[PDB]
Design a protein around this ligand. Sequence first.
Ligand SMILES: CCCCCCCCCCCCCCCCCC(=O)OC[C@H](COP(=O)([O-])OC[C@H](O)COP(=O)([O-])OC[C@H](COC(=O)CCCCCCCCCCCCCCCCC)OC(=O)CCCCCCCCCCCCCCCCC)OC(=O)CCCCCCCCCCCCCCCCC
Ligand SMILES: CCCCCCCCCCCCCCCCCC(=O)OC[C@H](COP(=O)([O-])OCC[N+](C)(C)C)OC(=O)CCCCCCCCCCCCCCCCC
Ligand SMILES: CCCCCCCCCCCCCCCCCC(=O)OC[C@H](COP(=O)(O)OCCN)OC(=O)CCCCCCCCCCCCCCCCC
Ligand SMILES: CCCCCCCCCCCCCCCCCC(=O)OC[C@H](COP(=O)(O)OCCN)OC(=O)CCCCCCCCCCCCCCCCC
Ligand SMILES: CCCCCCCCCCCCCCCCCC(=O)OC[C@H](COP(=O)(O)OCCN)OC(=O)CCCCCCCCCCCCCCCCC
Lengths: 117, 347, 98, 175, 318, 80, 115, 171, 105
Amino acid sequence: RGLSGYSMFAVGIGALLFGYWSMMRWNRERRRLQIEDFEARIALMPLLQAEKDRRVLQMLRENLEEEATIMKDVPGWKVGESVFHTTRWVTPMMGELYGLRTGEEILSSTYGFIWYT
Amino acid sequence: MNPIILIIILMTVMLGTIIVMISTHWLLIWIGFEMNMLAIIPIMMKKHNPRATEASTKYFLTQSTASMLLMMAIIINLMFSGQWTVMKLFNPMASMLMTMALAMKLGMAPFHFWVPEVTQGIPLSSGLILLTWQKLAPMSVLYQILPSINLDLILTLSILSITIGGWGGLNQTQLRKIMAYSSIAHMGWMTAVLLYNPTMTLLNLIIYIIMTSTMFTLFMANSTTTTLSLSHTWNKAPIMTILVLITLLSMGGLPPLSGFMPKWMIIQEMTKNDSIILPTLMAITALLNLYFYMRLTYSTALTMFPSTNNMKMKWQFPTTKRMTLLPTMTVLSTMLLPLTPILSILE
Amino acid sequence: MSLVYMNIMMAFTVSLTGLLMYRSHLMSSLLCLEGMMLSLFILATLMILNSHFTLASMMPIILLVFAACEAALGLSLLVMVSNTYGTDYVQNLNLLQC
Amino acid sequence: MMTYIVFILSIIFVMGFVGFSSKPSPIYGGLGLIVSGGVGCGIVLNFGGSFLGLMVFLIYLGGMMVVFGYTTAMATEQYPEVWVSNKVVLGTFITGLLMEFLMVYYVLKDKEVEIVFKFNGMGDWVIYDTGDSGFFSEEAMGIAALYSYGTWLVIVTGWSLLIGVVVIMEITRGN
Amino acid sequence: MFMINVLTLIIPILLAVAFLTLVERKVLGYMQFRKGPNVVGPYGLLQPIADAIKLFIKEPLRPATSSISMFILAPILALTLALTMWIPLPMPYPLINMNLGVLFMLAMSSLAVYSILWSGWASNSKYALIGALRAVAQTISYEVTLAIILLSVLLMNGSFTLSTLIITQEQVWLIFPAWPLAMMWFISTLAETNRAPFDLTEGESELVSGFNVEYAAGPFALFFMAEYANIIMMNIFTTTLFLGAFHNPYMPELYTINFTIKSLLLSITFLWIRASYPRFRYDQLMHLLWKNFLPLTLALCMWHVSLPILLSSIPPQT
Amino acid sequence: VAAFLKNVWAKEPVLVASFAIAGLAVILPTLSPYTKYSLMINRATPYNYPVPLRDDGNMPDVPSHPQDPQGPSLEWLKRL
Amino acid sequence: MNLMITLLTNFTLATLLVTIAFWLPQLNVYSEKTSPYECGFDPMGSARLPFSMKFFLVAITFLLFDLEIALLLPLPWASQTTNLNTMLTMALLLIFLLAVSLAYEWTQKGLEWTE
Amino acid sequence: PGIVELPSLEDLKVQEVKVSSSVLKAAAHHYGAQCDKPNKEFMLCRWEEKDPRRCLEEGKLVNQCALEFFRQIKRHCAEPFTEYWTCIDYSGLQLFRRCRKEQAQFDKCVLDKLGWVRPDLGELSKVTKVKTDRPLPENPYHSRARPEPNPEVEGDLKPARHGSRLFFWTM
Amino acid sequence: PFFDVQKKLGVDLDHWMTIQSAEQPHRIPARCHAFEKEWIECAHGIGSIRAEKECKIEFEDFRECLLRQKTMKRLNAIKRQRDKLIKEGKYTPPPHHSGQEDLRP
Ligand SMILES: CCCCCCCCCCCCCCCCCC(=O)OC[C@H](COP(=O)([O-])OC[C@H](O)COP(=O)([O-])OC[C@H](COC(=O)CCCCCCCCCCCCCCCCC)OC(=O)CCCCCCCCCCCCCCCCC)OC(=O)CCCCCCCCCCCCCCCCC
Ligand SMILES: CCCCCCCCCCCCCCCCCC(=O)OC[C@H](COP(=O)([O-])OCC[N+](C)(C)C)OC(=O)CCCCCCCCCCCCCCCCC
Ligand SMILES: CCCCCCCCCCCCCCCCCC(=O)OC[C@H](COP(=O)(O)OCCN)OC(=O)CCCCCCCCCCCCCCCCC
Ligand SMILES: CCCCCCCCCCCCCCCCCC(=O)OC[C@H](COP(=O)(O)OCCN)OC(=O)CCCCCCCCCCCCCCCCC
Ligand SMILES: CCCCCCCCCCCCCCCCCC(=O)OC[C@H](COP(=O)(O)OCCN)OC(=O)CCCCCCCCCCCCCCCCC
């Protein structure tokens, strides 16, 4: 009983060709959709970058205006002294921003993306 | 072994040494050492007897431990420098660990405890590969990190290697253990001049490889692995006794021979740097190497030990062996001292 | 430096002294070389993921490859010791002492 | 004490290393190395390397299954040492654990320590980047660059694995 | 409220294992011309409860020669790794949405071997020793193709994310471009999950009960409800790979019903295979996944690398 | 060559299918017109930000707005 | 966070199905029921004797081929590159080197078992 | 070293764009079309200064130009945009492909009432030229004087004086 | 023996993973790209002996970018003094270091 060999190989290769055609069309459509999502990301990035700059400068100024109040009795302390010889901007460390804040904000800001589900 | 597989495995040993020599990245140095070890293990187990398996196990454990210390030195360099360039090391801890790793890979004392064992366990051809070609990749890395090598460490390793390799060969009657303690003493000579003039390190490496390749080619051409079987060579091929005479007197550092060439130049570069005690102790300690070389010349060339009756059959058969470059290496290991200023090509 | 590098270097040294002090059993120390590879993996990978030097992120994979590419070598050299002798005890490998 | 999670996983990493480095038996050596390689893919997974931790987990699971098969076939004795059967196993196991928790105690009380290097005592959350990588995890991009940029590394690694197979079949012959 | 979301995962699949025992026995009965359990409940709907009460009130029988710590730790890790491979599975929304959920499935498949392996070693018995090292021979056989098949089918996905494997199969099933990979993956999951013809560790005709021959009831239950959890998870994983259903984002229950009935048909297919085929020998197992499936898997890996470049159909990674 | 091919298809057909699929995967991307579009799609996928240029005064090919006619276009991807 | 809660739950109610499996039934311990199983007769010798592995060369080569799926695994990400013919050449080079390895292990009878 | 110079808290106060991410992603293409010029002046200042403290004022222009983008949506097309960002906001990955009919209604209402063309596939990823009057930073890395290199080799290569001069070798 | 085949033949075998400032995939910067660029452009061509003392400042800034030892020591001092002032009760934390602050964006 059953079909011959050539008939089953023809049905299998035809199923291959149909799957390859359908995945060709759908992956080209998915690449176009990815480019659309990335251009939405690009168009949002200047506003997010400006808010991120004001965010980190807000946090560094809050860490600086509270460093002078803590560091008042300590002799020879220099408030806001850079640990770098250069005067170039350095991107802040995680401890430079969230070093004086609560552990909930620390965990949600430094392990939040990795631990998220 | 299937000769296609032998060709591929020997080209892979050579490829590991070349990948260490030509690469500017620390991971590729480590890959070259791993490839070198991995490919040279079946060269040691070419014969499949328990001594080759023991030698291969001891060699695998020593070289694997050395490669672990090498990669830890590489990762500490990555921490303290943020980069991977094969140059000086930016931490004395990584400098110490890499100097220990390369000293283990060279078999320099007090990490010398594998070189007579592994050299005795394996054949003379694989022992030649071990004592010559495997002394090229760690000497490359030592040539490349000498702005960061601790002076006290490399000089302690060097003089400890010279003393222990001198005393070790005096108690030996096996030719492979003699060549292994000779290796230890000569690597001490090469690394003692490493921070003063590494051109003399390369000179000593090249002259040593010539003399060691001459001695192993003479041992293979005579099929001798003990002192007392080398002592039958006068009754079979008396020119080979002359060749081992001139080569062993060359390896002892006697003028007017070329093995006096590295030693003298090493002294010539260590007295410039106001070190007088250290090359003097090195020269006096090389008399031990000369003493067991003279023991082998007494047993082989200068006297005639009694032979057997069956040697009369071996008079009727010539050598069909590939004594590859044996007259060339015999001439280069003995008569090269008038060409001593050729060492400037190694600059 | 950072606190985790203390314990990863500590694990390297623990596996180092475990390798470098044999307990007369060769498989128990071939595990220690594999542990040294694990500690080097995690140490290098913490350094590379920390500094965002992304192109060296392929480096620990390569490192890990040569890990088993010698570990398999050791096992291929473990079975020849354990075919000559009934056990893989390292004190049976003392023929080259003479 | 949840900000110290990478430190706590690293304590379990050192505990697994003292577990298999005391060398009880390669059954329990494989146990301890699986435990260390499974918390080590939790140390390094909290730095962003989710691909690069799952692989050191998976490769070492295959590795310890192979090592299990060999230590049941070759490295087997009648009474295997569990963790406490030998005095020299238990002594150095307790020694490694007491010295490890000793340098835990000296680094949480003082917030700095020095064994050969100097180490901080704050939680290692402090050193992370305060930015985002966009629509790519950067370690995946770097390991993806092994095919575009790492061509010589591909050639030497694939050649080393090929001759590793050839080398191993030349060793395990006997004649 | 995530703890409820965990308890609404593992408790309905400690029930689906229980009724899977009944479905296994009854489909095994009606394919062997007899009937299954129809005595305890209404046509057998209480026989799983009867077995689940019987196994946990029987004397546990810890042996005298057994390494007791590994003897107890091995069924705990069995049921632990049986439960924890359900968390990246999209139903259409997974419990824990992993960016690399496929490699989590693969790594926990590699870790779940040690439950069988340490259970066979710990119970110091000669039949449990043979059933332990047959798991080594089985795992060095399927794992060397379990990863390249799963690589080649994700070269049409673009990532290792299981949830993106629904978006991948929104037009056509991924069994149509990858049916050799599908009919090789299905056999690889038979060989993984210790189902017939690849039992080979609990191989009843050779080894009396195999690796768990010393495990009496109670700890025997956690190897018996772990393996069935592995077959339901594994057919859900095969359904997600090759038989991905329609997902409406406003009606998730349509996707849940669709992949549920597809995974039930694949579980019934496992029961069809267990009730009809002679069991391999565990070297002929190895000369199948190495001499037959591994070269063709390497060829299809070359093809599924080169084909999305050949047709400009490289799937997105986002 | 045909009799040996029939012989190996009769004896080891899995290996024949393996070498056939591998040979197609080797030779066929070099014989396809769509392999160019793979590279063109991959280099037109904007992961990074298109960092703008300071207008010196002489850049006729660089636009001043994304909806300007000059610049790289993706109409070939829209049609295909 | 949720991952460790899920793993803690799975481990917790996998070990709490064991502690109510040992402590709930009535124990009757005597030193013949806890003996090992050798089909009724007493076992001759210990099961801690070396059980010789016939598939040992395949087991060592599994260590090498499992590294290949640490090298071939970034191919869904390597296909996203902008140097793509080079990626395709290196990918086909890695699968071809794995295949040359498997062919060498075949023809030298490394896949067969001993005895 | 020196005191780090941070701006004060009053220097950072600006009327923020207090909308969610789906509201931003729904209006993203028209934001990249209409708010092109101060955004590109800001990102040019941001990659050239390499210092956010020298980029605040341009950044405020961004926060000036985004809000006027949304008020002009709020005055005219508040309800089709509200339905469109709600439908975007439902999805987990926030798919544009699940919301094409609300996108068509929003684009039609915007093109009728405000005359904005939505950017096509490929336009927002272009590298554009920006006409600014701020100076080019002459040292954005705050670097210093590079050390003087070693002098090169020059002159014709004469032979060695008396050969090698190695103890007695006259050549 | 640094037989520099890669510069003789002009091939790039491993110069690309050499430093962090090299060409990275998708233009991803390292966290110490500016520090390493300044150190390499300082120490280029002047040799190692002049580079160990004339480019010491850029290499100290770059090493302190890499390991952040001075930063973590300063944060140790700040956090320890803050904990001491909390323990003595001579200082209270502000509301924006406790949560109730209605954060920026
Ligand atoms: C129209 C166009 C064409 C016109 C063509 C016109 C010419 C036609 C002939 C061309 C061919 C060349 C012929 C020789 C030229 C002159 C070379 C010469 O005598 O230099 C004197 C040379 C320096 O003397 P000088 O008073 O300062 O200057 C006279 C010249 O103006 C020196 O002039 P220079 O300043 O230019 O010399 C440079 C430098 C000047 O020398 C120096 O800077 C002093 C340091 C030289 C090396 C010292 C090394 C000491 C430690 C090793 C000692 C080894 C053992 C000693 C020998 C044992 C026997 C093997 O020499 C070297 O660096 C080369 C090293 C010595 C090789 C000399 C040439 C030998 C060729 C034949 C080889 C036969 C075996 C020779 C012995 C083997 C050992 C060399 O004397 C020595 O070094 C003492 C040894 C004697 C030299 C070799 C004698 C050659 C004739 C041998 C015939 C009998 C052979 C018997 C069988 C073989 C022995 C068993
Ligand atoms: C995922 C959803 C389900 C998918 C389908 C699965 C459902 C069906 C399952 C049926 C029950 C199976 C129970 C277990 C059986 C185990 C035994 C078994 O299967 O052994 C495998 C058998 C083994 O056969 P064997 O063992 O007889 O092999 C003999 C080998 N020698 C000679 C060395 C002894 O077959 C295979 O290995 C084939 C695997 C699949 C092949 C797919 C080929 C696709 C087409 C290739 C190209 C062909 C054309 C040429 C090129 C053209 C190019 C244009
Ligand atoms: C600073 C870096 C410098 C780098 C310089 C590189 C130069 C070339 C490489 C030199 C390094 C050492 C070379 C020798 C390695 C050992 C080769 C070997 O063992 O070959 C095997 C073969 C065995 O001979 P057979 O009798 O057939 O064997 C029976 C069964 N085994 O044959 C033998 O064992 C016989 C010996 C063959 C090789 C000896 C000749 C080459 C080395 C001697 C110096 C030649 C002069 C030119 C180079 C100078 C620098 C070394
Ligand atoms: C004595 C014998 C042993 C007895 C005790 C046995 C205990 C149970 C053993 C089995 C469980 C082993 C777990 C191993 C680690 C698994 C890590 C994991 O699940 O990673 C998957 C996932 C990756 O997702 P990702 O791509 O990061 O996406 C998030 C980014 N947006 O990751 C995520 O989504 C990130 C979520 C947070 C991850 C935290 C770090 C991992 C925690 C490891 C816990 C300890 C593991 C111990 C292993 C022991 C092995 C025997
Ligand atoms: C060039 C394209 C890329 C090729 C390389 C990539 C391959 C990818 C697939 C992975 C393959 C890995 C394993 C390959 C092993 C081959 C060697 C082998 O197994 O030889 C033995 C076999 C006969 O088996 P036997 O000797 O009986 O073994 C004992 C068990 N019965 O011997 C045989 O079966 C005969 C083998 C030689 C003849 C095969 C002919 C196939 C022709 C297919 C059509 C043409 C395809 C284009 C390529 C040219 C082929 C000549």
